[PDB]
Design an enzyme around this catalytic site. Structure first.
Site, mmCIF file in Angstrom:
data_model
loop_
_atom_site.group_PDB
_atom_site.id
_atom_site.type_symbol
_atom_site.label_atom_id
_atom_site.label_comp_id
_atom_site.label_asym_id
_atom_site.label_seq_id
_atom_site.Cartn_x
_atom_site.Cartn_y
_atom_site.Cartn_z
ATOM 1 N N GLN A 102 26.626 -10.941 26.876
ATOM 2 C CA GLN A 102 25.672 -12.033 26.783
ATOM 3 C C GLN A 102 24.537 -11.651 25.876
ATOM 4 O O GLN A 102 23.880 -10.610 26.076
ATOM 5 C CB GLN A 102 25.171 -12.451 28.166
ATOM 6 C CG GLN A 102 26.185 -13.203 28.956
ATOM 7 C CD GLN A 102 25.729 -13.643 30.348
ATOM 8 O OE1 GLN A 102 26.567 -13.921 31.187
ATOM 9 N NE2 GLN A 102 24.401 -13.628 30.626
ATOM 10 N N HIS B 73 26.451 -8.721 41.002
ATOM 11 C CA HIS B 73 27.775 -9.357 40.887
ATOM 12 C C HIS B 73 28.783 -8.670 41.846
ATOM 13 O O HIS B 73 29.985 -8.533 41.536
ATOM 14 C CB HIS B 73 28.289 -9.284 39.415
ATOM 15 C CG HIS B 73 27.618 -10.236 38.463
ATOM 16 N ND1 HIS B 73 27.835 -10.187 37.097
ATOM 17 C CD2 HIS B 73 26.701 -11.223 38.661
ATOM 18 C CE1 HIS B 73 27.105 -11.122 36.507
ATOM 19 N NE2 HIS B 73 26.416 -11.776 37.435
ATOM 20 N N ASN C 55 30.822 -13.204 34.772
ATOM 21 C CA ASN C 55 29.996 -13.592 35.898
ATOM 22 C C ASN C 55 30.855 -14.288 36.928
ATOM 23 O O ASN C 55 31.588 -15.216 36.582
ATOM 24 C CB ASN C 55 28.876 -14.543 35.445
ATOM 25 C CG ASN C 55 28.348 -14.225 34.037
ATOM 26 O OD1 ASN C 55 29.037 -14.459 33.086
ATOM 27 N ND2 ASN C 55 27.063 -13.820 33.931
HETATM 28 C C1 LIG Z 1 19.549 -13.348 41.054
HETATM 29 C C2 LIG Z 1 20.331 -13.955 39.920
HETATM 30 C C3 LIG Z 1 21.694 -14.196 40.227
HETATM 31 C C4 LIG Z 1 22.523 -14.648 39.221
HETATM 32 C C5 LIG Z 1 22.106 -14.469 37.886
HETATM 33 C C6 LIG Z 1 20.802 -14.012 37.603
HETATM 34 C C7 LIG Z 1 19.953 -13.612 38.627
HETATM 35 C C8 LIG Z 1 18.519 -13.306 38.229
HETATM 36 N N1 LIG Z 1 22.777 -15.073 36.906
HETATM 37 C C9 LIG Z 1 24.047 -15.438 37.130
HETATM 38 C C10 LIG Z 1 24.784 -16.177 36.106
HETATM 39 O O1 LIG Z 1 24.416 -16.299 34.934
HETATM 40 N N2 LIG Z 1 26.052 -16.441 36.486
HETATM 41 C C11 LIG Z 1 26.683 -16.193 37.666
HETATM 42 O O2 LIG Z 1 27.827 -16.609 37.898
HETATM 43 N N3 LIG Z 1 25.968 -15.637 38.620
HETATM 44 C C12 LIG Z 1 24.641 -15.353 38.410
HETATM 45 N N4 LIG Z 1 23.866 -14.874 39.457
HETATM 46 C C13 LIG Z 1 24.503 -14.696 40.809
HETATM 47 C C14 LIG Z 1 24.692 -16.017 41.563
HETATM 48 O O3 LIG Z 1 23.401 -16.538 41.717
HETATM 49 C C15 LIG Z 1 25.448 -15.769 42.868
HETATM 50 O O4 LIG Z 1 26.713 -15.239 42.567
HETATM 51 C C16 LIG Z 1 25.632 -17.092 43.611
HETATM 52 O O5 LIG Z 1 24.393 -17.694 43.934
HETATM 53 C C17 LIG Z 1 26.415 -16.765 44.921
HETATM 54 O O6 LIG Z 1 26.529 -17.947 45.675
HETATM 55 P P1 LIG Z 1 26.722 -17.975 47.286
HETATM 56 O O7 LIG Z 1 26.550 -19.380 47.721
HETATM 57 O O8 LIG Z 1 27.947 -17.141 47.591
HETATM 58 O O9 LIG Z 1 25.510 -17.012 47.838
HETATM 59 P P2 LIG Z 1 23.868 -17.123 47.680
HETATM 60 O O10 LIG Z 1 23.506 -17.886 46.451
HETATM 61 O O11 LIG Z 1 23.467 -15.724 47.890
HETATM 62 O O12 LIG Z 1 23.409 -17.917 48.945
HETATM 63 C C18 LIG Z 1 23.798 -17.452 50.228
HETATM 64 C C19 LIG Z 1 22.770 -17.979 51.224
HETATM 65 O O13 LIG Z 1 23.031 -17.841 52.564
HETATM 66 C C20 LIG Z 1 21.856 -17.354 53.201
HETATM 67 N N5 LIG Z 1 21.971 -16.525 54.382
HETATM 68 C C21 LIG Z 1 22.172 -15.195 54.218
HETATM 69 N N6 LIG Z 1 22.310 -14.709 55.434
HETATM 70 C C22 LIG Z 1 22.313 -15.766 56.346
HETATM 71 C C23 LIG Z 1 22.413 -15.824 57.728
HETATM 72 N N7 LIG Z 1 22.580 -14.769 58.515
HETATM 73 N N8 LIG Z 1 22.340 -17.025 58.333
HETATM 74 C C24 LIG Z 1 22.151 -18.178 57.623
HETATM 75 N N9 LIG Z 1 22.037 -18.111 56.251
HETATM 76 C C25 LIG Z 1 22.134 -16.937 55.652
HETATM 77 C C26 LIG Z 1 20.691 -17.296 52.219
HETATM 78 O O14 LIG Z 1 19.376 -17.477 52.613
HETATM 79 C C27 LIG Z 1 21.251 -17.987 50.997
HETATM 80 O O15 LIG Z 1 20.523 -19.048 50.460
#
Ligand SMILES: *Cc1cc2c(cc1C)nc1c(=O)[nH]c(=O)nc-1n2C[C@H](O)[C@H](O)[C@H](O)COP(=O)(O)OP(=O)(O)OC[C@H]1O[C@@H](n2cnc3c(N)ncnc32)[C@H](O)[C@@H]1O
Ligand SMILES: *Cc1cc2c(cc1C)nc1c(=O)[nH]c(=O)nc-1n2C[C@H](O)[C@H](O)[C@H](O)COP(=O)(O)OP(=O)(O)OC[C@H]1O[C@@H](n2cnc3c(N)ncnc32)[C@H](O)[C@@H]1O
Lengths: 573, 573, 52, 104
Positions: free
Chosen positions: A403, A503, A548
């Site tokens: 990238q 990742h 990604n």
């Molecule tokens: C940080 C970030 C990530 C990112 C990136 C750049 C940065 C600065 N750029 C990316 C990109 O260009 N392309 C790509 O494909 N990925 C990129 N990323 C990563 C991406 O954001 C993640 O892979 C994606 O968001 C993963 O999605 P998923 O839905 O699997 O997970 P999440 O976004 O982490 O949200 C999970 C949530 O669940 C919650 N949570 C956690 N524990 C609990 C419990 N116990 N109970 C209830 N809820 C829970 C969180 O609070 C959260 O919102």
């Protein structure tokens, strides 16, 4: 009581919501985090007018919501304290450090985000497809059918994310970089725009996609959706799924309301865990899957023995460059330039349509106007030029994702001396072989801030191919970037801290057969042995991948939803 | 067409909203920034469960929304670039720098926040009153009446903010610090809790106040307020108030919708500008008050000649300390401690109610429990102890405000070696004499990111008393802090960059007579000569003050609302 | 620089700073072992680190 | 202007310079090892009072230079180590090694 309960409101939970709310299920969704993105629930935080006028400020927003997973005990010596200051005689467990964590076998950069919409509130929006060499099989023993299945799923996923490859087509800097790189590789590497989940609204504003794009997270029924049923419950920590005795069904979900402090149990027909790669694993181990505590090769878990093993995280290398004289001069190659800037006789002109022109009239107009209206400025690049968004995608001969962009960045005082238009970021992402010894485990003694078993990594980049490629990847970035300009001091080529890239995959990995493929879920993302428990996210990805992963995770989640739709009936409204 | 239009949704705009919506006016409010704080519009961003479990992360949120006002042209030499990299032959105007800005006469730390709720989305919530020596007069030639007026206004302001002085009363660290300091000053300086706009919800959660606390910013009429009328319009840049020819009335407000890009004009009976100290001034100068361009002593402005002159900003000194052995030992002074921690014979006991005990049973219980349940931890301070919140308020003999706390802080790698429970922040704030030569002016050529005249500072801390006191203030912090412990390396005593403190006042200052008091508004916050234009905010404050100014600004705004209520009639519903 | 050039530290403790931004191909020990002339008898918290 | 303020340290029996029976230095001689903390009591109280005195005194001449703010230097950077083979009248009574002729 609901038809489906989803844990996590990230883009993968929102994929399940989108599919299943739309199909007429009574859906509840819980997130430990809160609504803190505007009135468009779960939307991208960079979508304010103010951030897109002050883009380098957004790095602070990212940093503000990345909480480190496992911090080892600090042993740095501070011996310049006053003699009257209190000091311990040992480096004792402090400041939230994890005493189980070996500092030399960590992913120190691993962090999590707990807000509605998850990490999709701040992500970069790069959504490439995986080629075959990176991608798990959905159909065995028929590559054509496997390719067809993946194409249909990815196409739908790109639809949900609003993925495009044309939103930066009029950037001078994008062109300048892409056009040079593609000339220098002899036709043997292809360069394109990074596929981005984004919709340009004007020449200076891009609506970056998020969880909200996938599913708007508004409670239903509502005026727009009178026959759909959805509730979202923020600030609810999901603590435990309750297994039956036969390990064939989930019977309830224990939740903790963070505001009132009360604990409840919630009944559903179908349980979907989309809490992220780290926190899916944690919730499972807290519910009796795998095992709590330091793992023992003697005593393996009887339930999901592969959970938390074969974890993968990518190697990431980074630098910035300052654009070469050759490339800056090329911007203005079609111009006749006479006189000295700021003096009466200064002029910059081109001949529209001339065949010997290197650039189209749209480029030359922009440059001439910039050069004539800002004679105090020595660069030919217009001021609101969109940022470069360039890649050469992973291939067998260069098995790393790339990238080449100009993302939000907190420049030091001396770097800020360099005009931002000259600066290009390089990020190259390597693939990591899944190895059984690479683990995410959970303490039986130590807990995190939410009173849940404390995550601990046992990780090293595998010897062999993984390490050889990572170093070859660093070299490739040195070689490639030199074609565009030299390195920017303070941003010299470097490996980033393990897991800063975020990742992580393979924590609850997919395969055809639990034993044979050393895995936890099948190709419907259903947990082996259980009729009604599904996992979504990058933790399902079982392969060595550089690109990604979110789009691929989403594609698997669509497939999982199809299975749920084929096997569970919505309750009557 | 509205009764009242308010520009800015900070806590001062919300004060006007609160008063005037409540009184039955048809109110519109515009903010250039967007709703990005949760569904409680304009609320404190630190009020998530996740931030209060990860408090040091919040510094990133603050940094993420402070956009520098005026950055000079950078002249740092980077001569370690590759020879192929393009480089200009001069330090030309770049990266958003302000070429009008003399780098040696700046408030380089001055920044603004453009989000709904303004800076109250991230502020520290300290709301002290000003004593007489810091406070402008509301009544001339009767100090008793002046004191009565101020007491009534401040009391109402404290009500709106939910100011308290008891929310940290059970912190061991708060006590440890306060109790020592008050013993060491011979009864001649008083120490109390910092008055804080905050309501404790549990022993580990505090609901910090904001603009939302003052006025909830929901459109009206609504179910809770069926007979009130209020609309809020985010992402609307307010560009110009339109003066009549006689400079006696405002006739409309020009606005620019940032989303659609369209420009409108809005008619009201009453116009209130609460856009901050910098941006109130800018909006006025763009509307023909004062003058655009470098100011000339030869050619003074004919309209509001004092606008943008006599500006004040506080000097701010800072350090951190590591708590002394004497104070840590005192925590456990009432305990009998036998054996070695972690061994079979180790015990920590106290005798409840004993008269020779230094501390009450509640303290001793907490400490004994912490010491016995965490024998691996060498400190007697419990883990979720609330942070210190200590002050000795400004007085003639120590004319500076003080705050002794443990606020969000991004510790370096080596500082992170020190247990956070040992660490105390010191911030001392000096008062600045208003001087006519200290100015905020606006370029007639250069514009900011919103196409508005670019702000430029001409500021130096006045010679004489201001500078003498600032240095005496630094010394006072060195002397005082030494009573609690030594300095923390990396946070040694220092002056902060001018205007990082963000307590700018006097930009559109209040007084009784425009000419005699060299001012812009009267004690109703009404602009001299105009029947229907009011300014609110710290820019109204005309005095040399050390204490945090928002409460005083709010008090003046309540008084202004009273005037509006006495003189303009609400339209019929 | 002349002063610094002739002050040789008396007792340097074993260094335990984590460098985890190395390339995966670089060799790394699994422990903070006695190296670079450090004194393994030296408790880092009961030293005169500046003595030379 | 540079400010250097130097405090006095009470001699305490527990503050030691000893030599390894296993580890050697670059000249194959027994490796020196310190067991040192600034004594509690007067020594530490004075050191901190000394820091304060330098803050107060120096303010009369001008403000601190950024990057050279008031600080304690690393223990023993000052190179004024004493008492390692100390003088007194009587070996036992004065806990010492040499007499007032510096004779062992
Ligand atoms: C940080 C970030 C990530 C990112 C990136 C750049 C940065 C600065 N750029 C990316 C990109 O260009 N392309 C790509 O494909 N990925 C990129 N990323 C990563 C991406 O954001 C993640 O892979 C994606 O968001 C993963 O999605 P998923 O839905 O699997 O997970 P999440 O976004 O982490 O949200 C999970 C949530 O669940 C919650 N949570 C956690 N524990 C609990 C419990 N116990 N109970 C209830 N809820 C829970 C969180 O609070 C959260 O919102
Ligand atoms: C940044 C912060 C500030 C703060 C502090 C700590 C930090 C990190 N701690 C403080 C504390 O302990 N006590 C105290 O009294 N003050 C503290 N502060 C400062 C405080 O936040 C400000 O004094 C206060 O917020 C000022 O209130 P006011 O309502 O006057 O101004 P505002 O909050 O800046 O909001 C003004 C708004 O108007 C907008 N805007 C600006 N320009 C326009 C235009 N042209 N058109 C329409 N709207 C405009 C902004 O977007 C903003 O929200």
């Amino acid at each position: 009581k609901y038809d489906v309960v989803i844990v996590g409101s990230g883009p993968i939970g929102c994929t399940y919501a989108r599919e299943l709310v739309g199909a007429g299920y009574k859906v509840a969704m819980f997130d430990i985090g809160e609504i803190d993105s505007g009135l468009k629930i779960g939307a991208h935080k960079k979508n304010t007018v103010e951030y897109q006028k002050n883009i380098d400020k957004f790095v602070n927003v990212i940093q503000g919501q990345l909480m480190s997973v496992s911090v080892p005990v600090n042993t740095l010596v501070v011996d310049t304290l006053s003699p009257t200051s209190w000091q311990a005689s040992t480096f004792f467990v402090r400041n939230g450090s994890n005493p189980e964590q070996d500092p030399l076998r960590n992913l120190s950069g691993q962090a999590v985000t707990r807000v509605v919409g998850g990490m999709s509130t701040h992500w970069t929006c790069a959504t490439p497809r995986f080629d075959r060499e990176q991608r798990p099989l959905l159909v065995k023993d028929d590559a054509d059918a496997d390719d067809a299945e993946w194409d249909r799923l990815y196409t739908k996923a790109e639809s949900y994310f609003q993925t495009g490859t044309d939103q930066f087509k009029e950037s001078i800097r994008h062109n300048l970089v892409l056009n040079k790189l593609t000339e220098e590789y002899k036709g043997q590497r292809d360069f394109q725009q990074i596929p981005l989940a984004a919709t340009r609204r004007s020449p200076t504003f891009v609506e970056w996609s998020s969880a909200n794009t996938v599913f708007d997270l508004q409670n239903r029924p509502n005026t727009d959706a009178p026959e759909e049923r959805f509730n979202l419950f923020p600030a609810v920590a999901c603590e435990r799924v309750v297994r039956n005795a036969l390990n064939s069904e989930i019977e309830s979900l224990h939740i903790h309301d963070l505001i009132s402090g009360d604990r409840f149990e919630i009944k559903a027909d179908v349980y979907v865990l989309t809490a992220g790669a780290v926190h899916n694993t944690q919730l499972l181990v807290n519910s009796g899957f795998g095992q709590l505590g330091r793992p023992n090769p003697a005593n393996p878990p009887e339930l999901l023995p592969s959970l938390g093993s074969y974890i993968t995280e990518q190697s990431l290398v980074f630098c910035q460059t300052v654009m070469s004289t050759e490339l800056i001069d090329s911007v203005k190659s079609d111009m006749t330039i006479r006189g000295t800037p700021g003096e009466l006789t200064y002029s910059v002109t081109y001949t529209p349509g001339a065949s010997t022109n290197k650039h189209p009239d749209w480029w030359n107009e922009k440059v001439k106007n910039h050069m004539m209206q800002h004679q105090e400025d020595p660069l030919p690049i217009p001021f609101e030029d969109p940022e470069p968004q360039v890649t050469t995608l992973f291939q067998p001969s260069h098995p790393w994702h790339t990238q080449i962009q100009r993302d939000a960045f907190s420049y030091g005082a001396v770097q800020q001396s360099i005009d931002s238009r000259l600066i290009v970021d390089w990020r190259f992402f390597g693939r990591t072989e899944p190895k059984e010894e690479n683990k995410l485990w959970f303490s039986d003694k130590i807990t995190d801030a939410y009173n849940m078993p404390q995550p601990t990594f046992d990780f090293r980049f595998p010897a062999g191919r993984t390490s050889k490629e990572a170093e070859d990847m660093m070299t490739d970035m040195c070689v490639m970037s030199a074609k565009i300009g030299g390195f920017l001091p303070g941003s010299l080529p470097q490996f980033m801290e393990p897991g800063l890239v975020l990742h992580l995959g393979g924590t609850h990995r997919m395969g055809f057969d639990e034993k044979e493929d050393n895995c936890c879920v099948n190709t419907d993302s259903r947990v082996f042995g259980f009729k009604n428990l599904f996992l979504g996210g990058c933790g399902n990805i079982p392969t060595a991948y550089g690109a990604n992963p979110t789009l691929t995770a989403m594609s698997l989640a669509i497939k999982s939803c199809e299975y749920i739709k084929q096997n569970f009936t919505p309750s009557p409204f």
